[PDB]
Design an enzyme around this catalytic site. Structure first.
Site, PDB file in Angstrom:
ATOM      1  N   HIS A 181     -42.455  44.645 -31.958  1.00 56.74           N
ATOM      2  CA  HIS A 181     -41.813  45.364 -30.825  1.00 56.74           C
ATOM      3  C   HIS A 181     -40.349  45.665 -31.131  1.00 56.74           C
ATOM      4  O   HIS A 181     -39.901  46.827 -30.943  1.00 56.74           O
ATOM      5  CB  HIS A 181     -41.996  44.513 -29.573  1.00 56.74           C
ATOM      6  N   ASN A 224     -42.579  48.210 -16.624  1.00 56.01           N
ATOM      7  CA  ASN A 224     -43.873  48.867 -16.708  1.00 56.01           C
ATOM      8  C   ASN A 224     -44.822  48.501 -15.578  1.00 56.01           C
ATOM      9  O   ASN A 224     -46.008  48.367 -15.826  1.00 56.01           O
ATOM     10  CB  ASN A 224     -44.536  48.614 -18.052  1.00 56.01           C
ATOM     11  N   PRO A 234     -26.691  47.198 -11.205  1.00 57.10           N
ATOM     12  CA  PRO A 234     -26.237  48.545 -11.023  1.00 57.10           C
ATOM     13  C   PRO A 234     -25.344  49.096 -12.125  1.00 57.10           C
ATOM     14  O   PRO A 234     -25.326  50.320 -12.356  1.00 57.10           O
ATOM     15  CB  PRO A 234     -25.404  48.502  -9.723  1.00 57.10           C
ATOM     16  N   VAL A 294     -25.354  48.838 -15.446  1.00 51.24           N
ATOM     17  CA  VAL A 294     -25.921  49.175 -16.763  1.00 51.24           C
ATOM     18  C   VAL A 294     -26.819  50.400 -16.542  1.00 51.24           C
ATOM     19  O   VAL A 294     -27.024  50.925 -15.398  1.00 51.24           O
ATOM     20  CB  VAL A 294     -26.730  47.990 -17.316  1.00 51.24           C
ATOM     21  N   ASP A 351     -34.188  41.703 -28.851  1.00 53.37           N
ATOM     22  CA  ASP A 351     -35.639  41.844 -28.813  1.00 53.37           C
ATOM     23  C   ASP A 351     -36.327  40.796 -29.643  1.00 53.37           C
ATOM     24  O   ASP A 351     -35.788  39.688 -29.732  1.00 53.37           O
ATOM     25  CB  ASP A 351     -35.977  43.304 -29.203  1.00 53.37           C
ATOM     26  N   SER A 393     -39.917  50.249 -22.699  1.00 49.44           N
ATOM     27  CA  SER A 393     -39.310  49.646 -23.900  1.00 49.44           C
ATOM     28  C   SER A 393     -39.106  50.747 -24.960  1.00 49.44           C
ATOM     29  O   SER A 393     -38.240  50.546 -25.827  1.00 49.44           O
ATOM     30  CB  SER A 393     -40.173  48.605 -24.592  1.00 49.44           C
TER      31      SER A 393
HETATM   32 CA   LIG Z   1     -28.840  50.609 -13.240  1.00 44.54          CA
END
Ligand SMILES: [Ca+2]
Length: 279
Positions: free
Chosen positions: A69, A161, A175, A177, A39, A224
Site C-alpha cells: 500500500h 472509504n 479542518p 489539513v 504508511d 488512499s
Molecule cells: Ca479538511
C-alpha cells in the site's frame, strides 16, 4: 512535457475533460520538493523511484514495505511512470504494519516525527505529507495532523472509504489539513468515497495503476489513491512557486475543475484536482 498512455488519473489531473490518456506537466516535475508518505513503507529499490525514495523511520522490526500500500501511494506521488511529481524526493515513514494496521499512538508519533524531520532534509521548494490512512474520530489524531500542517508541511489526508460523512473519521475531519475524496474515470464520485463539508478536494481514486512491492505494478482503488495525486500536485505547484505549504489546499481548490463530478451529495464540494498546466 507530455507522457503518452499515462494512467487515467494523471491524464485527468492535467485535463479540463475526462477521457484522455496523455499527462501534461511542467518539466520541473516537483524537483527540490519533498513528500513524506506515512504508511506501510516504500520499496525504495523499485526502479520506478530512480533513487529518489528512501525510508527515514519505522516503528516496527523493519522499514521494509511488506504490504504494498505505501509503495503504491508513493508511486502515485512521485514514480517516473505512475507519479504526479516525477522529480520529487520521497521519504517513507512506516507507521502501519504489513497488514496495513497501526495504533493511533504510533500514527501520531509519526506525524510529530515528520514535523521535526523536515529540518534534517533538503526541500527548498517545500514539504508535503500524504496520509492514506484513517479510523474513527480522534481529537488527538486530528491535533497531530493540525500540528504537522502548522509546522509548515502541506498535509493531504484520505477522506475514507465508508461512503459516509467524513466528519466521523480522523484525520479526515481535521479542518486545517486537505481532506481528499475519490473519483473514477467517468467523473463519478467513487462508490466507496466519503463525503461531507470537511472535504476539500477530490482526486482520482478508482482503478489507479502504480508501483507495488517486488518491483511490480498493480491497479487498486481507494481514497488512499486519491490522496497522493493531491500530495504530488501540491509538491509540483510548490516547485513552480505558485503556492506554499500553508496555502496549497486553498490554491488547489481555487484552481480545481468545478462542477464536473456526479453523485456529489449536496453540501460536499464539487472540485476535482487540476494542474492548470498549459503546454
Ligand atoms: Ca479538511
Amino acid at each position: 512535457a507530455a507522457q503518452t498512455n499515462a494512467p487515467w488519473g494523471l491524464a485527468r489531473i492535467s485535463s479540463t475533460s475526462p477521457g484522455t490518456s496523455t499527462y501534461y506537466y511542467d518539466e520541473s516535475a516537483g524537483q527540490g520538493s519533498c513528500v513524506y508518505v506515512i504508511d506501510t513503507g516504500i520499496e525504495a529499490s523499485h526502479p520506478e523511484f530512480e533513487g529518489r525514495a528512501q525510508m527515514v523511520k519505522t516503528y516496527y522490526y523493519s522499514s521494509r514495505d511488506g504490504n504494498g500500500h505505501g509503495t503504491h501511494c508513493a508511486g502515485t506521488v512521485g514514480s517516473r511512470t505512475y507519479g504526479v511529481a516525477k522529480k520529487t524526493q520521497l521519504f517513507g515513514v512506516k507507521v502501519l504494519d504489513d497488514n496495513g494496521s497501526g495504533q493511533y499512538s504510533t500514527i501520531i508519533a509519526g506525524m510529530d516525527f515528520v514535523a521535526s524531520d523536515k529540518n534534517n532534509r533538503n526541500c527548498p521548494k517545500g514539504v508535503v505529507a500524504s496520509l492514506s490512512l484513517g479510523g474513527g474520530y480522534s481529537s488527538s489524531v486530528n491535533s497531530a495532523a493540525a500540528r504537522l500542517q502548522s509546522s509548515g508541511v502541506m498535509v493531504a489526508v484520505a477522506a475514507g472509504n465508508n461512503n459516509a460523512d467524513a466528519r466521523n473519521y480522523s484525520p479526515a475531519s481535521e479542518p486545517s489539513v486537505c481532506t481528499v475524496g475519490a473519483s473514477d474515470r467517468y467523473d463519478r464520485r467513487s462508490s466507496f468515497s466519503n463525503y461531507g463539508s470537511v472535504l476539500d478536494i477530490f482526486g482520482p481514486g478508482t482503478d489507479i495503476l502504480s508501483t507495488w512491492i517486488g518491483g511490480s505494478t498493480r491497479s487498486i482503488s481507494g481514497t488512499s489513491m486519491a490522496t497522493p495525486h493531491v500530495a504530488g500536485l501540491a509538491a509540483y505547484l510548490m516547485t513552480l512557486g505558485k503556492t506554499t505549504a500553508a496555502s496549497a489546499c486553498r490554491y488547489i481548490a481555487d484552481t480545481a475543475n468545478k462542477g464536473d463530478l456526479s453523485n456529489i451529495p449536496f453540501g460536499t464540494v464539487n472540485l476535482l484536482a487540476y494542474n492548470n498546466y498549459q503546454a
